[PDB]
Enzyme design. Structure first.
Site, PDB file in Angstrom:
ATOM      1  N   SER A 196       0.847  -1.155   0.000  1.00 22.88           N
ATOM      2  CA  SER A 196       0.000   0.000   0.000  1.00 22.88           C
ATOM      3  C   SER A 196       0.902   1.229   0.000  1.00 22.88           C
ATOM      4  O   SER A 196       2.029   1.203   0.494  1.00 22.88           O
ATOM      5  CB  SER A 196      -0.916  -0.029   1.227  1.00 22.88           C
ATOM      6  OG  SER A 196      -0.207   0.359   2.388  1.00 22.88           O
ATOM      7  N   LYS A 242       5.726   3.384  -0.524  1.00 22.04           N
ATOM      8  CA  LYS A 242       5.078   2.097  -0.534  1.00 22.04           C
ATOM      9  C   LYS A 242       5.641   1.321   0.618  1.00 22.04           C
ATOM     10  O   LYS A 242       6.877   1.172   0.733  1.00 22.04           O
ATOM     11  CB  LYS A 242       5.398   1.323  -1.806  1.00 22.04           C
ATOM     12  CG  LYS A 242       4.588   0.051  -1.959  1.00 22.04           C
ATOM     13  CD  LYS A 242       4.998  -0.656  -3.213  1.00 22.04           C
ATOM     14  CE  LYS A 242       4.414  -2.051  -3.315  1.00 22.04           C
ATOM     15  NZ  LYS A 242       4.926  -2.636  -4.590  1.00 22.04           N
ATOM     16  N   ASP A 258       5.512  -1.034 -11.639  1.00 24.62           N
ATOM     17  CA  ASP A 258       4.947  -2.388 -11.712  1.00 24.62           C
ATOM     18  C   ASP A 258       3.889  -2.650 -10.632  1.00 24.62           C
ATOM     19  O   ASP A 258       3.052  -3.538 -10.756  1.00 24.62           O
ATOM     20  CB  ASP A 258       6.009  -3.471 -11.824  1.00 24.62           C
ATOM     21  CG  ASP A 258       5.464  -4.758 -12.427  1.00 24.62           C
ATOM     22  OD1 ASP A 258       4.251  -4.805 -12.727  1.00 24.62           O
ATOM     23  OD2 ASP A 258       6.229  -5.747 -12.582  1.00 24.62           O
TER      24      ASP A 258
HETATM   25  O1  LIG Z   1       6.726   0.267  -9.263  1.00 22.21           O
HETATM   26  C1  LIG Z   1       6.938  -0.571  -8.379  1.00 22.21           C
HETATM   27  N1  LIG Z   1       6.830  -0.329  -7.039  1.00 22.21           N
HETATM   28  C2  LIG Z   1       6.330   0.840  -6.550  1.00 22.21           C
HETATM   29  C3  LIG Z   1       5.123   1.356  -6.985  1.00 22.21           C
HETATM   30  C4  LIG Z   1       4.640   2.534  -6.450  1.00 22.21           C
HETATM   31  N2  LIG Z   1       3.477   2.904  -6.963  1.00 22.21           N
HETATM   32  C5  LIG Z   1       3.018   4.151  -7.102  1.00 22.21           C
HETATM   33  C6  LIG Z   1       3.733   5.348  -6.947  1.00 22.21           C
HETATM   34  C7  LIG Z   1       3.072   6.569  -7.134  1.00 22.21           C
HETATM   35  C8  LIG Z   1       1.709   6.573  -7.487  1.00 22.21           C
HETATM   36  C9  LIG Z   1       1.005   5.364  -7.642  1.00 22.21           C
HETATM   37  C10 LIG Z   1       1.672   4.170  -7.442  1.00 22.21           C
HETATM   38  O2  LIG Z   1      -0.308   5.080  -7.974  1.00 22.21           O
HETATM   39  C11 LIG Z   1      -0.960   5.998  -8.843  1.00 22.21           C
HETATM   40  C12 LIG Z   1      -1.208   7.124  -8.072  1.00 22.21           C
HETATM   41  C13 LIG Z   1      -2.576   7.335  -7.879  1.00 22.21           C
HETATM   42  C14 LIG Z   1      -2.976   8.419  -7.107  1.00 22.21           C
HETATM   43  C15 LIG Z   1      -2.019   9.268  -6.537  1.00 22.21           C
HETATM   44  O3  LIG Z   1      -2.405  10.339  -5.789  1.00 22.21           O
HETATM   45  C16 LIG Z   1      -3.843  10.379  -5.625  1.00 22.21           C
HETATM   46  C17 LIG Z   1      -4.203  10.871  -4.215  1.00 22.21           C
HETATM   47  N3  LIG Z   1      -3.784  12.271  -4.068  1.00 22.21           N
HETATM   48  C18 LIG Z   1      -2.567  12.408  -3.247  1.00 22.21           C
HETATM   49  C19 LIG Z   1      -1.995  13.817  -3.435  1.00 22.21           C
HETATM   50  O4  LIG Z   1      -2.980  14.675  -4.081  1.00 22.21           O
HETATM   51  C20 LIG Z   1      -4.324  14.581  -3.466  1.00 22.21           C
HETATM   52  C21 LIG Z   1      -4.849  13.139  -3.541  1.00 22.21           C
HETATM   53  C22 LIG Z   1      -0.658   9.047  -6.730  1.00 22.21           C
HETATM   54  C23 LIG Z   1      -0.250   7.974  -7.518  1.00 22.21           C
HETATM   55  C24 LIG Z   1       1.143   7.835  -7.605  1.00 22.21           C
HETATM   56  O5  LIG Z   1       1.860   8.824  -7.638  1.00 22.21           O
HETATM   57  C25 LIG Z   1       5.335   3.220  -5.451  1.00 22.21           C
HETATM   58  C26 LIG Z   1       6.558   2.714  -5.003  1.00 22.21           C
HETATM   59  C27 LIG Z   1       7.040   1.517  -5.554  1.00 22.21           C
HETATM   60  F1  LIG Z   1       8.148   1.052  -5.131  1.00 22.21           F
HETATM   61  C28 LIG Z   1       7.464  -1.828  -8.714  1.00 22.21           C
HETATM   62  C29 LIG Z   1       8.571  -1.902  -9.549  1.00 22.21           C
HETATM   63  C30 LIG Z   1       9.115  -3.143  -9.888  1.00 22.21           C
HETATM   64  C31 LIG Z   1       8.551  -4.327  -9.396  1.00 22.21           C
HETATM   65  C32 LIG Z   1       7.446  -4.259  -8.556  1.00 22.21           C
HETATM   66  C33 LIG Z   1       6.900  -3.007  -8.236  1.00 22.21           C
HETATM   67  C1  LIG Z   2       9.892  -0.308 -12.928  1.00 16.71           C
HETATM   68  C2  LIG Z   2       9.014  -0.928 -14.010  1.00 16.71           C
HETATM   69  C3  LIG Z   2       9.551  -2.318 -14.407  1.00 16.71           C
HETATM   70  C4  LIG Z   2       8.432  -3.340 -14.220  1.00 16.71           C
HETATM   71  C5  LIG Z   2       8.897  -4.564 -13.433  1.00 16.71           C
HETATM   72  C6  LIG Z   2       9.051  -5.737 -14.395  1.00 16.71           C
HETATM   73  C7  LIG Z   2       9.028  -7.087 -13.672  1.00 16.71           C
HETATM   74  C8  LIG Z   2       9.897  -8.097 -14.431  1.00 16.71           C
HETATM   75  O1  LIG Z   2      10.378  -9.227 -13.658  1.00 16.71           O
HETATM   76  C9  LIG Z   2       9.456 -10.338 -13.815  1.00 16.71           C
HETATM   77  O2  LIG Z   2       8.291 -10.114 -12.965  1.00 16.71           O
HETATM   78  C10 LIG Z   2       7.201 -10.987 -13.318  1.00 16.71           C
HETATM   79  C11 LIG Z   2       5.891 -10.400 -12.738  1.00 16.71           C
HETATM   80  O3  LIG Z   2       6.159  -9.114 -12.154  1.00 16.71           O
HETATM   81  C12 LIG Z   2       7.674 -12.384 -12.845  1.00 16.71           C
HETATM   82  O4  LIG Z   2       6.635 -13.343 -13.048  1.00 16.71           O
HETATM   83  C13 LIG Z   2       8.970 -12.797 -13.603  1.00 16.71           C
HETATM   84  O5  LIG Z   2       9.526 -14.024 -13.131  1.00 16.71           O
HETATM   85  C14 LIG Z   2      10.056 -11.718 -13.487  1.00 16.71           C
HETATM   86  O6  LIG Z   2      11.123 -12.041 -14.381  1.00 16.71           O
END
Ligand SMILES: O=C(Nc1cc(Nc2ccc3c(c2)OCc2ccc(OCCN4CCOCC4)cc2C3=O)ccc1F)c1ccccc1
Ligand SMILES: CCCCCCCCO[C@@H]1O[C@H](CO)[C@@H](O)[C@H](O)[C@H]1O
Ligand SMILES: CCCCCCCCO[C@@H]1O[C@H](CO)[C@@H](O)[C@H](O)[C@H]1O
Length: 339
Positions: A33, A49, A162
């Site tokens: 979250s 997160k 992601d």
């Molecule tokens: O991306 C990977 N991991 C990863 C993902 C995230 N994901 C994020 C980040 C940012 C945001 C988000 C998702 O969702 C979209 C969103 C929707 C609404 C919002 O603000 C709306 C509410 N507002 C607040 C202020 O203004 C008034 C009301 C902000 C955002 C946004 O800005 C965060 C950290 C991580 F680490 C990852 C990468 C590789 C493998 C697995 C996962």
């Molecule tokens: C920062 C944006 C990059 C997106 C993350 C890519 C994830 C790639 O990595 C892959 O993740 C899959 C599901 O997530 C797994 O099933 C695979 O084994 C793994 O190789």
């Protein structure tokens, strides 16, 4: 080492450095979250997160490490980047929480679902492809590209995520390449191009391109648009299972895209035809796509970087939860902020 402060938010406890103030949930979904917060140190709004149950099972443990590794590696303006990673844990022994910090964008793309202008589309898709080029060049396939995995700020700048949000404070199959649903052995990178294709289409029409009720329905809808596989594509299907169902279906022809995407920019139409080819070997790559005439006003080949090589060897490793944990811990510890 900074000072941490606890705080109950959602049903969860957030133990974050005071560096980050005014946490507020953006929501959550798959594997954690996210809170919007203010970064007193940079003055920037960030997203924090908190991983949920990062070391629940070996699978979670590995997923937690993979995300940390991915994030720490992503250094691109169109790809979610790591500003910070921290844990309350003073030691490996009590390490059981992981907080990832990124830029707050403020929105994701199903957050403009309720038709964009061709220029907005153009810019968004460019940025997606630019991020994908980068991702793909590290030998990373996203595999789950969909509106919710695309964070956009007010400037219409886009980062690929992601971790999309599911609960904000309704289907994944709609964007998946057909091969991913025929549960193909090995996907190529252009699975992601297909999803871009679906995403673009949706931005131009304001309609989900293939709103399949399920994998069968989805595939039925895809073929309706792109037509059944020609014998050239059939040749490449090892799965006697797949091959059976395929050449038993209605022998649909490829629709005229110009007619399905009526009055869309014909440059967009042309890109969509390039992207939404069933045969993944024949789909335009993200790099090729950046060159396409559709993005002439955005395409800059000297500023469409590729990634440093990404060491994905860990993916094939079968380790104990504590080994994934300790590897994650080393990743947390070795983390160096961006300049
Ligand atoms: O991306 C990977 N991991 C990863 C993902 C995230 N994901 C994020 C980040 C940012 C945001 C988000 C998702 O969702 C979209 C969103 C929707 C609404 C919002 O603000 C709306 C509410 N507002 C607040 C202020 O203004 C008034 C009301 C902000 C955002 C946004 O800005 C965060 C950290 C991580 F680490 C990852 C990468 C590789 C493998 C697995 C996962
Ligand atoms: C920062 C944006 C990059 C997106 C993350 C890519 C994830 C790639 O990595 C892959 O993740 C899959 C599901 O997530 C797994 O099933 C695979 O084994 C793994 O190789
Ligand atoms: C109706 C079902 C037809 C779907 C056909 C999907 C074909 C996707 O394309 C296939 O991708 C494979 C890897 O994923 C590659 O090895 C093949 O070369 C390529 O043909």
């Amino acid at each position: 080492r900074p000072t941490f402060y606890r705080q109950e938010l959602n049903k969860t406890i957030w133990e974050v450095p005071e560096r980050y103030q005014n946490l507020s949930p953006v929501g959550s979904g798959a594997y954690g979250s996210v809170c919007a917060a203010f970064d007193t140190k940079t003055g920037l709004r960030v997203a924090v997160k908190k991983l949920s149950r990062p070391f629940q099972s070996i699978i979670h443990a590995k997923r937690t490490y993979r995300e940390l590794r991915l994030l720490k590696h992503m250094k691109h303006e169109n790809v979610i980047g790591l500003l910070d990673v921290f844990t309350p844990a003073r030691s490996l022994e009590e390490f059981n929480d992981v907080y990832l910090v990124t830029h707050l964008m403020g929105a994701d793309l199903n957050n403009i679902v309720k038709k964009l202008t061709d220029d907005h589309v153009q810019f968004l898709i460019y940025q997606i492809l630019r991020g994908l080029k980068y991702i793909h060049s590290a030998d990373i396939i996203h595999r789950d590209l969909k509106p919710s995995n695309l964070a956009v700020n007010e400037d219409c700048e886009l980062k690929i995520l992601d971790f999309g949000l599911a609960r904000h404070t309704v289907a994944t199959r709609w964007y998946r390449a057909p091969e991913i649903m025929l549960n193909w052995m090995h996907y190529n990178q252009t699975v992601d191009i297909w999803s871009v294709g679906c995403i673009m289409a949706e931005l131009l029409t304001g309609r989900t391109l293939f709103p399949g009720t399920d994998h069968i329905d989805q595939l039925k809808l895809i073929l309706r648009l792109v037509g059944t596989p020609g014998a050239e594509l059939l040749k490449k299907i090892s799965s006697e299972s797949a091959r059976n169902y395929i050449q038993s279906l209605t022998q649909m022809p490829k629709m005229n895209f110009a007619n399905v995407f009526i009055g869309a920019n014909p440059l967009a139409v042309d890109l969509l035809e390039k992207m939404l080819v069933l045969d993944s070997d024949k789909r335009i790559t993200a790099a090729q796509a950046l060159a396409h005439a559709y993005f002439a006003q955005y395409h800059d080949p000297d500023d469409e970087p590729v990634a440093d090589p990404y060491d994905q060897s860990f993916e094939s490793r079968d380790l104990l939860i504590d080994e994934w944990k300790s590897l994650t811990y080393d990743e947390v510890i070795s983390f160096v902020p961006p300049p």
